[PDB]
DNA sequence: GTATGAAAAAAAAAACGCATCCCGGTGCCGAGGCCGCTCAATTGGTCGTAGACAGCTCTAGCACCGCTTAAACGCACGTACGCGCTG
């Protein structure tokens, strides 16, 4: 027969799941290609220690995770539950990341 | 090109989940890519600048570590 | 016979002083003769950049003499100087005029 | 007979009279400018110091300064600074 | 008798103080608050008047800043009136408080 | 009372005006005093710590300047 | 012919076996601990360096370290650290 | 759907008044510039070593390849959240 969890019940489960864990959440290659792509702009025919790329990924994920925590609060502060661009922008504007 | 699309919707969803986000506006997935890009640009620029100063063609972990320290986002466990 | 290093480098800013400040500031064991010239210049350039803009802000206030507020206005209105002096407070600077749109009447 | 307090104020005047010969500067402003110089001096020196340290080199050269400046100043401001620096070193090595 | 609508003056005040740079806290009450707080860390302490002035420049500047940020948080909630929870958010995001 | 009340409602109103605030909840005036205190506590503590290290009985401007730099709130126009 | 890279890892083990003799530590964790030591070392040294500079003194003594530690560590952590530091210097000067 | 009048809501027009901008007008003090003293930068010579350079060694970073399966993608559905409106 049918079974269907109400909208949000899974999201919450996912939250608990990923907070419990420490594994990197972006796929390792697509990231590595994005790194080299961005590094080309500064100098071509560049090589990277695999550890160097991993460090960049640890930093990135950590940064974003953090930005989201802050964003979430901004969303909630507006009596919402759904994060939206303007929430991120506020968080960065206050963090002093942007003007 | 645009490996920035390689940063898949579901991967961003995952990160925001670890951030304790329950519901995510469609617009956010592009917004995030942009922010992520700006981050990597600023960090890598510095990393490479350290690489170039060492007259190396190979970016070391330390190059990234030293770079992040400058940006005030110190990283432990890559030889800080 | 004897002329200032500043003169040889074509600078106002004291190459001699800077070279000393570097040795006496526990920055490194030894200080290249090139270093203090270069540094002196950069400091000189930045000084000019700010003064040019402050000097403009002062002409824009029918004042002969630059005051703090001028230096602030100059810095906070130039994208790049703001970013450089992002974590700096300028004594008696005031803030840029700015009233959020939604706060104005209809 | 009071104790000589060093200051960049004479060099700020000289540079002011270049960029606006018909413009002056309040003591308070001049204060801010002195702070500004000392601040960015420490910033550049510091980053240069580390650059040397990181590369197991004992000596801070105009190379280290340049790299520091590229790291510390935003785009346009960096380009200009670097030029003025290179220009000045070039001019000094050629006047021996 | 003549009476400006609630807000018309507030706006005027905004324009007035943004235009100006004079310190907005009364110089003595502040100086007493400085010495009072310094007693906690060490008694029979003296202060250069310049040291006190620096503390005041820093304080006002800091607060002015915090308010700008607070205001945005208030507005972000479709409000115009800043409230404690607005400040708290601003500080929580600034990483001033946990 | 002590001196924290010396930071008068109207003075806070004034600061928040320079911040471009239009309307201020009564609760804010005490909230602000508390924050202001926390600030001065953190800054002065450090300033005094510098004073003590210099074996001085008199807090100098520089003591405050050096202290604020540590707190990441650098101040221009009082030296250094 | 390998690089001969120094590390605090042996001193972290020794201290670990004191505080929990029946527990060990993943290489990655040990990495983090090495980072941690180096970070706070640089922090304290740095603040000590400036302390000296500011007070026109050429020499970094245990006094400068203490002051640095009082400035850098929060309340309880500072108290403890200072004590352990004072204790250790006292113990060393008295063992000639 | 042509013509209806009755209020409701908005828009414009005409006046009462406070604030703000300009002025020209007067005095005060700090900005500005000079003078003498001094010690901090410059000079010219000796010495020690940092590091640039070439020659060599082998790390580990690149590319490639095929297999399995986990994750990405899409589409369909329907709820509950955002968001406007009201008192
Ligand atoms: Ca602008
Ligand atoms: Ca006149
Ligand atoms: Ca010579
Ligand atoms: K290699």
Taking residue G17's Cβ as centre, other Cβ atoms within 10 Å add up to 12
Q: Is E82 helix (H, G, I), strand (E, B) or coil?
A: strand
CB-based burial of residue F10 (10 Å sphere; 0-12 exposed, 13-18 middle, 19+ buried)? Answer: exposed
Q: Going by C-beta distance under 8 Å and a sequence separation of 6 or more, which residues neighbour residue D13?
A: D25
- Dihedral class, residue A13 (left if φ above 0, else alpha if ψ from -120 to 50, else beta): alpha
CB contacts, 8 Å: E56 with chain C: none
CA C69 / ligand 2 centre spacing (Å): 22
Q: Answer for C20: CB within 7 Å of strand H.
A: yes
Assign E18 to helix, strand or coil.
Answer: helix
Q: How far apart are CA G52 and CA F53, in angstroms?
A: 10
- Of A51, B80, B68, nearest to G35 by C-alpha is B80
**What is the count of residue pairs from C and G with beta carbons less than 8 Å apart?**
3
Length A50 CA → H63 C1' (Å): 15
Residue F46's Cα: distance from chain center in Å? 12
**Contact at CB, D45 and C42, closer than 8 angstroms:** no
Instruction: Name chain A contacts of E94, Cβ cutoff 8 Å.
Output: 94-95
* C-alpha–C-alpha distance, residues A84 and B8, integer Å: 18
- Among G43, B73, E26, which Cα is nearest to A62's? B73
**Distance (Å, whole) CA F42 – CA F67:** 9
Contact C68, D27 (CB under 8 A): no
Q: Which domain holds residue C92?
A: 1-106
Distant-in-sequence, close-in-space partners of D79: CB < 8 Å, separation ≥ 6? none
Cα B15 from Cα A26, distance rounded (Å): 8
Method: X-ray
Q: CA B32, CA B10: separation in Å to the nearest integer? A: 12
Rounded to 10 degrees, the C-alpha dihedral B41/C74/F77/G66 comes to -10
Give phi and psi for E81, each to the nearest 5. Answer: -100, 115
Q: Which of residues 2-41 of D touch F (CB under 8 A)?
A: 28, 31-32, 34-36, 38-39
Q: Which residues in chain C have Cβ-Cβ distances shorter than 8 Å to D22?
A: 64
d(CA A30, CA A43): 20
**Strand, coil or helix: what is F26?**
coil
Establish whether chain E is in contact with chain B, requiring a minimum of 3 CB pairs below 8 angstroms: no
Say how many Å lie between the CA of residue C59 and the centre of ligand 2: 17
**Whether the Cβ atoms of residue G9 and residue G27 lie closer than 8 Å to each other:** no
Chain D from 35 to 64: CB within 8 A of any C CB: 36-37, 39-41, 44-46, 48-49, 52, 58-64
One-character DSSP codes across B17-75: HHTT--EE-TTHHHHHHHHHHHHHHHHHHHHHHHHHHTT-SEE-HHHHHHHHHHTT---
Nearest of E74, E23, E61, E68 to residue F17 by alpha carbon:
E68
Indicate the domain borders of chain D: 1-96
What span, in angstroms and rounded, lies between the C-alpha atoms of E16 and D94? 56
Token reading at A95: 């963090």
Which chain A residues 8-27 have CB under 7 A to strand H?
8, 27
CA nearest to E83, candidates F24, A50, G72, C73: F24
Is residue D91 classed as helix, strand or coil in its secondary structure? helix
Question: Of the candidates B19, E73, E82, C98, which has an alpha carbon nearest to the alpha carbon of residue A89?
Answer: E73
Mind giving me the DSSP string for E20-63?
A: --S--S-HHHHHHHHHHHHHTT-SS-EE-HHHHHHHHHHHHHHH
Structurally, how many domains does chain C consist of? 1
Residue F53's closest CA among E42, C30, B33, C34?
A: E42
Q: Distance from first CA to last CA of chain E, Å, rounded? A: 51
Q: Mutate which of D33, D34, D35, D45 to disrupt the F interface (most F C-beta within 10 Å)?
A: D35
The position carrying tokens 């940006």 is B71
G9 phi/psi in degrees, rounded to 5: -60, -35
Q: Are D88 and C11 in contact (CB under 8 A)?
A: yes
Find the radius of gyration of the CA atoms of chain B: 15
Beta bridge partners, B24, equal A83
d(CA A70, CA A85): 12
Resolution (A): 3.4
Note the helical H segments in D1-96: 9-19, 27-54, 62-72, 75-94
Q: Alpha-carbon distance C6 to B8, whole Å?
A: 56
Beta strands B23-24 and A82-83, pairing class: parallel
CA distances B18 to A13, A14, B73, G48, Å, are 11, 8, 19, 39
| DSSP tag of D21 | T
- Please, are residues B35 and A67 in contact by the beta-carbon 8 Å criterion? yes
Q: Which of residues 13-42 of E touch strand H (CB under 7 A)?
A: 15-16
Question: Does any strand H atom come closer than 7 Å to the Cβ of B70?
Answer: no
Instruction: Find all residues with CB under 8 Å of C23, minimum gap 6, and list them.
Output: C31
D67 touches chain B (CB under 8 A): yes
Among candidate residues B77, A18, C37, the one with its CA nearest the CA of residue G28: B77
Residue D51 touches partner B, C-beta closer than 8 Å? yes
């Amino acid at each position: 027969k049918p079974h269907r969890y109400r909208p949000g019940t899974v999201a919450l489960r996912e939250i608990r799941r990923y907070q419990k864990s420490t594994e990197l959440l972006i796929r390792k290659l697509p990231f590595q290609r994005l790194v080299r792509e961005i590094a080309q702009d500064f100098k071509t025919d560049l090589r990277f220690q695999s550890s160097a790329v991993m460090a960049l990924q640890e930093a990135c994920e950590a940064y974003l995770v953090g930005l989201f925590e802050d964003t979430n609060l901004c969303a909630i502060h507006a009596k919402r539950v759904t994060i939206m661009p303007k929430d991120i922008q506020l968080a960065r504007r206050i963090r002093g990341e942007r003007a | 090109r645009d490996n920035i699309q390689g940063i898949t919707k579901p991967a961003i969803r995952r990160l925001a989940r670890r951030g304790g986000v329950k519901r995510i506006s469609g617009l956010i997935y592009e917004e995030t890519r942009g922010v992520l890009k700006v981050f990597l640009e600023n960090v890598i620029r510095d990393a490479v600048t350290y690489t170039e100063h060492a007259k190396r063609k190979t970016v070391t972990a330390m190059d990234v570590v030293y770079a992040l320290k400058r940006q005030g986002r110190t990283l432990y466990g890559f030889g800080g | 016979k004897a002329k200032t290093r500043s003169s040889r480098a074509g600078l106002q800013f004291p190459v001699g002083r800077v070279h000393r400040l570097l040795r006496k500031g526990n920055y490194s064991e030894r200080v290249g003769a090139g270093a203090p010239v270069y540094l002196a210049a950069v400091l000189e350039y930045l000084t000019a950049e700010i003064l040019e803009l402050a000097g403009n802000a002062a002409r824009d206030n029918k004042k002969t003499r630059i005051i703090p507020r001028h230096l602030q206005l100059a810095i906070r209105n130039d994208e790049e100087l703001n970013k450089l002096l992002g974590r700096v407070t300028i004594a008696q600077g005031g803030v840029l005029p700015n009233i959020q749109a939604v706060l104005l009447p209809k | 007979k009071r104790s000589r307090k060093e200051s960049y104020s004479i060099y700020v005047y000289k540079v002011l009279k270049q960029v606006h010969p018909d413009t002056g500067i309040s003591s308070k402003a001049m204060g801010i400018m002195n702070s500004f110089v000392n601040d960015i001096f420490e910033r550049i020196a510091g980053e240069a110091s580390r650059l040397a340290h990181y590369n197991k080199r004992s000596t801070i050269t105009s190379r280290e300064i340049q790299t520091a400046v590229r790291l510390l100043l935003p785009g346009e401001l960096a380009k200009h600074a670097v030029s003025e620096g290179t220009k000045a070193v070039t001019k000094y090595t050629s006047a021996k």
